[PDB]
Amino acid sequence: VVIFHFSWKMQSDVWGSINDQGVVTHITGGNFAQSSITINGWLRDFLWAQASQVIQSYGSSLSAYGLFFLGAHF
Amino acid sequence: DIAGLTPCKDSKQFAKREKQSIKKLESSLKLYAPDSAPALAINATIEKTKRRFDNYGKQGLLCGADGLPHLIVSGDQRHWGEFITPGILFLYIAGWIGWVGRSYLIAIRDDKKPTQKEIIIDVPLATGLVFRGFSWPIAAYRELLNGELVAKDV
């Protein structure tokens, strides 16, 4: 729970891309305030949304992570 | 052909997979220089992909609507290389392993401490027994007819 808190907080309120004029858009659109106050929000707006990369990594250089995901489940 | 399948040499999806795979590797190739080491690596992977697809289409592999080789294990003589022939090869190897290990356990069962030669391998005894599995279907078959393979009343 600690590391999931860290991940979602950094991807929602800090990490992102900054414009030339100073417009910062975070990796997730500041969804931490409204989505993380709910267990269903943690299930949907965190796990279901951010597991896309690992369930789509087949056929790329990140496919080893897609294999380790399921092997660790096993 | 069989089960509605079409041979991979005739399937368009099979050839489209080979095209799209090679073109995807070529898309990775344009990023690097023609004399580069990643270039020779990607070129070797492309040649390896062509060899794989050509070999699958040449040996009579059947393809589904997905353009992927489907195997037929019913025993049809047109596809014995897909299961029965490699399966006989496996059963030869598996019987070899089991027969040699069995010969080892029989040879050490009369030792003072049989557990000693099970956690510390007697490599000389092993090296002398590893080649008895070469004729395992014979030595086993004879032990079947002579009542030596199965322990009586267990």
Binding site: G59, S61, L62 | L31, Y32, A33, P38, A41, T45
Partner: protein, 74 residues
Amino acid sequence: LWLSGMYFHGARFSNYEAWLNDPTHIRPSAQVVWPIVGQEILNGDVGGGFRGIQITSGFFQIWRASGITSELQL
């Protein structure tokens, strides 16, 4: 021995000299796999003309902070 392996991989199978010139675009990588059973797909485009596995240990940042530049020092 583990640290020896780390510095040696930074020297022999890495793109540290390329990450040193463009640290914001290059992905740090210090492991390159052999091409045997198609696992060379894991040697992904990491920038600087390098195909490898992106590393997250942070040895590039440490070696830059210490002042290391050439593969010889590693």
